[PDB]
Design a binder for this molecule. Structure first.
Ligand SMILES: c1cnc2cc3c(cc2n1)[C@@H]1CNC[C@H]3C1
Ligand SMILES: c1cnc2cc3c(cc2n1)[C@@H]1CNC[C@H]3C1
Ligand SMILES: CC(=O)N[C@@H]1[C@@H](O)[C@H](O)[C@@H](CO)O[C@H]1O
Ligand SMILES: CC(=O)N[C@@H]1[C@@H](O)[C@H](O)[C@@H](CO)O[C@H]1O
Ligand SMILES: CC(=O)N[C@@H]1[C@@H](O)[C@H](O)[C@@H](CO)O[C@H]1O
Ligand SMILES: CC(=O)N[C@@H]1[C@@H](O)[C@H](O)[C@@H](CO)O[C@H]1O
Ligand SMILES: CC(=O)N[C@@H]1[C@@H](O)[C@H](O)[C@@H](CO)O[C@H]1O
Ligand SMILES: CC(=O)N[C@@H]1[C@@H](O)[C@H](O)[C@@H](CO)O[C@H]1O
Ligand SMILES: CC(=O)N[C@@H]1[C@@H](O)[C@H](O)[C@@H](CO)O[C@H]1O
Ligand SMILES: CC(=O)N[C@@H]1[C@@H](O)[C@H](O)[C@@H](CO)O[C@H]1O
Lengths: 362, 358, 358, 358, 362
């Protein structure tokens, strides 16, 4: 009489002579069709330094078996029931791309029988994939991470996947804040491996995502760009003060720190190099060259006619240079001159490098 | 001894199956009255946007096949049972990190003779609440907690609240974080009509003293030295040292504060903003100061400083209310004048920014 | 061989059920006498407010269906049993972090013929005790440990103590931390009347030498240089260097000490307080010192230093007991005078604060 | 439908027991042909001497009680089975950290009608390979992987290789690390005669560019300033600043590089060696430079600089090819001379060390 | 016929009427002898800061029972079989010295029956012990870590341990690189506890190990020793330059950093103190005293006769001191003098302290 009693009688009749490990097909050459799909829930972390990607994802499978069928009019008009996924057939679906993970679902949520043998399963999962990280246009970066699902011990003449929706559902996506999903496609594919002769299918989900660049633009690059204006300036500073090498050393050490600090956020791949590390490197090069030339200057200025000599030809040369420079016995005037002429060249060089480096991209 | 007979009569595998749910008279819904009871707010990890709490969620419902006759069984109105063998409705978070949904202990379950059931297990929950970080540290965070089954739907169960507020009888104070309100709301979807959820919205306020002392005071105390290098004389040969040191300390504090807060590029806090602005200010200061120093260390033989300087600056003197003036001495005085002018406009802009914050 | 027969007669699944508790003559309570025995105090993590210990808690109780006739079974007064199959009363912490409550090994259980039972398993426990941090490092911490069941209540069991103090015979010294007292108190609630608990209150004192050497000595040693830059002459061009270096070292020590202690904004330690105060002092010093330097490097052409300075300062000279005085020389002497005055008041305030600590 | 009958006939609990191994005709050994197939080389953590890989190890063997008649069972030459119920030979690492030995998934197992079995599960393995760190970063590491059972011995099974090389068909490039060879060798002990193992020896080479850019270039670039402070004039009052800054940057780089590499006191890398040497050099430089500075600042009234200096130094002038020289001026010139001499020998020693590296 | 068939029959006969929880002895007075031993495999980590020791160790036990016996000629000449350690008796062997561990083996490797009741068991284990760390002669340190095995609920009249080899086997030891095992002994002992009246045995394995000192000698002490030569030197630096306190402050801060950094590698025990921290502390003391005295000097030098006065007696005193010093109103000359006389005393003091501190050890 009660729906629950008929439900018992049915459930007890179905699982009398059932064998989990037996494939659910009547004719051996017949195959089952495992409709497959995903639905993100959030994108926990994307670890660049270790090249990993954590996802919380609601797998979706459905298929059809030939033993879990009945007639509803005989059991008080019940068509759908719910049973654990621990007592029926359950296909082996793995991702070959794991890294510190579990290779399969172990939450084992229940399953919904639909009166026509159709069965539907939706276990959650936390998956840790490994996607290669390309870092040149840091932080304005578009990353591309993959996930390769597929079967393990069943060829294409026993199991054949089918993609339900060619796009990854995002109805319950939870905005992580830093990374946004431009698009997420799902491809079908086949392959052949060395173990065996048959071909095996597979499905490949590709997430193309972008980084919101405000944070690293407002905490990392603005100061390294703000203490690079001071790379060429020391030359406009005289020699009687005694604060040239101080400034130079400070700038050098600061840039070295910023580089040695950004090396913590990017991987150690050698195929490519970012665009910030290279610029900082060129800057450090030119500033140490600047400290060299300014110590040479400081030595020139503090000279004296008794201690040092040989202004033989420099007289003509520098009194002929000073007019071109539009600046109109004593060594100090020549120090000023050489300082100015190096200042012009270094502003030109910093300009030209900072420029010719960032142009091809834009 | 009866308890044994009663139990072993109730949980008989033939008479009672667990994989199904109790229903009669046309697949009627089984109500599930649940209310949560906090115990303490362990942690709020901003850098990862996570919240760790300890919780006892009491569920109650009704089952029609767990009843008996009290007088037969020696007048027993109540028993304990294990919560693995009886039915139970699955109820967990959805916004959970760690991928751990269900509860930990799986405690016993009370049972009366009318069939009611009252089950509260404990749990530690790692929820994911988004941090609104603009008024740091004086901020009011807002952490959400979902509750809904993930095997059944609305056409087989219907969740309900018992008290609109989360009980706080066992709340042990947390120190840092202090609660304000713990509302709880039922939510439903008309377009879907198969989406019932319960959302509790903890509203938290931070106690500011600690971070105040450890960050703000040094931060303002140091930035209070950016409007001062101009009052320093260029003969000392020291402006560069002070300015550079200030700039470096400033960058350090900036990187640090950006570490302590999450990397959400959606919004920017106030402190990093103020600090970036005053950093720009101090670098403008360093460049204008080197210009001043150079003009100070000029000599008569090298430059003539022809008319413009003389009249312009020795006449600008009074507009500053700065006064009253050998060529090298005139150089030095020009330097003094210009640096005082810059000092004036810089203190003006500092006050202007302090106002801009209000 | 008898042991086999005896055991397989006692734990018979038909004669003995585990899911129930032993009772007769009107649901009488079963007493549970438990006492704890420490082994070592592994750690006290302040930054997270946690304490890790190793413990053996001996429970004892009585069961009326685990008795036999000794003479029948070859005169056996005692046996071992596994502690999964027999009954046992659930007893754990409540203030536990890690969400791990129960014990680890689940050791064997002794059994006599009167029915008594004496069971002590081992455990490592991560308790959560709040740190009262004001007299750092000379502090006396106080870590609590609860004990109560989480399936039963007072109307089915009644816990009891055997010794008011936690034994310490197998204890091994800990190094850093040193115990003082280990009281243990039973607690009950009249308003509730179903809340029995046992609370052990370890009282700990820290040994100061390590942190003393590594933090205090450098701290005081450095801050002892803040009252000294005034005794430095302004011609050296070096006051700024020393003052700045001191301030930066000070900020560093401050951040560090705030790292080592937990972020409880409820109370503030003494060291950070003293350090913040002397930091404020040294920045006031830097600003007044730049003023002094500027007034020193003034020349006659640029300023006239008209009457007020002359009489006021060249007459203030004696009030300091500082003595006895070309215009640039008068400038320099004014600077000397003012800096000595500031030195006097600063050493006075330093002594005043050192007193304020007592 | 037959598959059901066949399976439920093979794995019958009475006919087939799992806890034993297949043997006949005098306890003959069952061969176990295993070969590994790499998928990717996840990580190589030097600081802890660990290697994380993903692996599929194919085992094959023969069982005489898992055979059938194909024509009876509708001509079935092949079936799948679960790998918990059938026999299987235990095979794992021995050098494993994490204490995790066995495989993760426990995949299905193929079965033919001759009784053969072909089973490959996946795995992530954390091996422990010792890092030979002398040519950093241009180093060729060598990570070992064992394989042997830990329940059986050689008198009950005999392991065998199928291909002397580990397959790389499914391998995905790793970025940093690049493979060279993957030999695999069987190993046996004559003294023991019960020790069979398989050892695969991955040979890896690091790609240097990244660490080159980020460490070497700054390192050499900075140390290139240690032979230069001598060319700086002592009137500037700046040698100390430069030397000190260089020394501190150097110590920092040293500590850092020692962090990145493991704390094996067995061997010392080349970079730390070079850096320590040049650090010693620069401190010798600082001390000789202060001596030079002192002799430069001396005045006539304070010292007489009696004969020795005059003749010795004003005659050493030409041996340097340094030339041609009021007493204070002679002081300054003596300083110039001595500093140039030191500069010469220091550049000589720098070249000498650069040679010493080759 | 087949060895496997007889093996089944035997295995099925043995476990018909067996009870795990029953002690394997015929006469209650009779005891079993649990031969015991270890074999290291490596020494993963020795955490000084937390006072812990991780070991991977191959426990070895063997005993004899009276029910697992048979006759081999009746079962086709089988004497040895292999069964899981989950179906037979298995003694309770614990270490009382755990710290964040498991108190017993959780791997449960199989066991080898030997036809005479003898049984042999060798489960692996990862053990985390807590050994007190003594740190005075850092890094030249000899540490001594313990492990106390023993039984839990069995007295000496039911179980009695026996040490197999008085030394810990090291045939498969894996050289960790930093720590070497000088020796490793195993002692037997008894005790009596408050719980009970009977006595309980125990075994105590002691590992005496040494540290290879090259790393910390190359990266930690050489620089702190190299920037201590510069503690006394500032005095040989004149006052007209303006670079004395700079040097002094730099040295002070550097030493403070090195001390505040080494405090991270050693525990916070207060019983003792290292030998490096103490030396660094004395050095910091003397260098701050040096900054005090040199500021006093700087003040003296820059004085002037008009501003300052009272060279009343100093004339005689210092013109009488300068000859003893072998150095021949002058604010400058008396400054030089006082500087020299403090330099001599400070070199003497640094010498004498660095010396008299490290002597008793060697
Ligand atoms: C029988 C049993 N297991 C297998 C596992 C795999 C294959 C064939 C198998 N055949 C390869 C194809 N799919 C995963 C791997 C590799
Ligand atoms: C009953 C069951 N097991 C015990 C284990 C031990 C004791 C008493 C016990 N009582 C202590 C005395 N011997 C080993 C430990 C500690
Ligand atoms: C935008 C983009 O590049 N998407 C790529 C796709 O073209 C490629 O087929 C796949 C495999 O590499 O990975 C992803
Ligand atoms: C319940 C929910 O999901 N979002 C709420 C929304 O209903 C509401 O309009 C708003 C103001 O209360 O706060 C948010
Ligand atoms: C003060 C406040 O904003 N409370 C909010 C509430 O308005 C909102 O319905 C819910 C979803 O945002 O989270 C909480
Ligand atoms: C037992 C407890 O929960 N709190 C105690 C309280 O009973 C007592 O008044 C006070 C003084 O001893 O210390 C606290
Ligand atoms: C010296 C001291 O305060 N001991 C306290 C005790 O007074 C108090 O009952 C309990 C709860 O605070 O913790 C412990
Ligand atoms: C296999 C082994 O354990 N150690 C080998 C050894 O056999 C060999 O002598 C040497 C040269 O190949 O390399 C190592
Ligand atoms: C190039 C090289 O050394 N390969 C070695 C091999 O010689 C050695 O047999 C084994 C054990 O060290 O590890 C690998
Ligand atoms: C070399 C050495 O000291 N070995 C000691 C040993 O003497 C002592 O008996 C044992 C217990 O403290 O610990 C270890």
């Amino acid at each position: 009489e009660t729906r629950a009693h008929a439900e018992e009688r049915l459930l007890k009749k179905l699982f009398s002579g059932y064998n989990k490990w037996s494939r659910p097909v009547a004719n051996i050459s017949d195959v089952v069709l495992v409709r497959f799909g995903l639905s993100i829930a959030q994108l926990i972390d994307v670890d660049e330094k270790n090249q990993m990607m954590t996802t919380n994802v609601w797998v979706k499978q459905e298929w059809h078996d030939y033993k879990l069928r009945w007639d509803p009019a005989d059991y008080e008009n019940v068509t759908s029931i719910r049973i654990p996924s621990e007592l029926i057939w359950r296909p082996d679906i793995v991702l070959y791309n794991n890294a510190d993970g579990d290779f399969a679902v172990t939450h084992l949520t229940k399953a919904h029988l639909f009166h026509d043998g159709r069965v539907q399963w939706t276990p959650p999962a936390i998956y840790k994939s490994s996607c290669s990280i390309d870092v040149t246009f840091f932080p304005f970066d578009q990353q591309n991470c993959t996930m390769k699902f597929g079967s393990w011990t069943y060829d294409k003449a026993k199991i054949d996947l089918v993609n339900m929706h060619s796009r990854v559902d995002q109805l319950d996506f939870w905005e992580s804040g830093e990374w946004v999903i431009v698009d997420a496609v799902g491809t079908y594919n086949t392959r052949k491996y060395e173990c065996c002769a048959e071909i095996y299918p597979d499905i490949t989900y590709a997430f193309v995502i972008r980084r919101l660049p405000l944070f690293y633009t407002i905490n990392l690059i603005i100061p390294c760009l703000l203490i690079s204006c001071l790379t060429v300036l020391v030359f406009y500073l005289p020699s009687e003060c005694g604060e040239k090498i101080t400034l130079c050393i400070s700038v050098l050490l600061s840039l070295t720190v910023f580089l040695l600090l950004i090396t913590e956020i990017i991987p150690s791949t050698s195929l490519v190099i970012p665009l910030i590390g290279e610029y900082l490197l060129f800057t450090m090069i030119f500033v140490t060259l600047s400290i060299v030339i300014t110590v040479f200057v400081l030595n020139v200025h503090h000279r004296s006619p008794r201690t040092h000599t040989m202004p033989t030809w420099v007289r003509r040369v520098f009194l002929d240079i000073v007019p071109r420079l539009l600046l109109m016995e004593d060594w100090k005037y020549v120090a000023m001159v050489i300082d100015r002429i190096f200042l012009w060249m270094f502003i030109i060089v910093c300009l030209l490098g900072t420029v010719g480096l960032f142009l091809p991209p834009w | 001894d009866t308890e044994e007979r009663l139990v072993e009569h109730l949980l008989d595998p033939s008479r009672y199956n667990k994989l199904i749910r109790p229903a009669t008279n046309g697949s009627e819904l089984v109500t599930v009255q649940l209310m949560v009871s906090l115990a303490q707010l362990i942690s709020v990890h901003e850098r990862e946007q996570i919240m760790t709490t300890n919780v006892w969620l009491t569920q109650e419902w009704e089952d029609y096949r767990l009843t008996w006759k009290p007088e037969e069984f020696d007048n027993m109105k109540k028993v304990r049972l294990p919560s693995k063998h009886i039915w139970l409705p699955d109820v967990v978070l959805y916004n959970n990190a760690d991928g751990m949904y269900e509860v930990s202990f799986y405690s016993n379950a009370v049972v009366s003779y009318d069939g009611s059931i009252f089950w509260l297990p404990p749990a530690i929950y790692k929820s994911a609440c988004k941090i609104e970080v603009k008024h740091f540290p004086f901020d009011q965070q807002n952490c959400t907690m979902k509750f809904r089954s993930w095997t059944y739907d609305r056409t087989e169960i219907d969740l309900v609240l018992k008290s609109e507020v989360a009980s706080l009888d066992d709340f042990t104070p947390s120190g840092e974080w202090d609660i304000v309100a713990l509302p709880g709301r039922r939510n439903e979807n008309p377009d879907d009509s198969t989406y019932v959820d319960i959302t509790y919205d903890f509203i938290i306020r931070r106690k500011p003293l600690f971070y105040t002392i450890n960050l703000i005071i040094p931060c303002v105390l140091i930035t209070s030295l950016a409007i001062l290098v101009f009052y320093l004389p260029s003969d000392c040969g020291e402006k560069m040292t002070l300015c550079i040191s200030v700039l470096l300390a400033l960058t350090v504090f900036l990187l640090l504060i950006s570490k302590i807060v999450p990397p959400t590029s959606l919004d920017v806090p106030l402190v990093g903003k103020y600090l970036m602005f005053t950093m720009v200010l101090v670098t403008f200061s360093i460049v204008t100061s080197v210009c001043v120093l150079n003009v100070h260390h000029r000599s008569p033989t090298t430059h003539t400083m022809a008319p413009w300087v003389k009249v312009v600056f020795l006449e600008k003197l009074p507009a500053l209310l700065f006064m009253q003036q050998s060529v090298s001495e005139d150089w030095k005085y020009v330097a003094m004048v210009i640096d005082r002018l810059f000092l004036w406009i810089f203190v003006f802009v500092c006050v202007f920014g302090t106002i801009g914050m209000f």
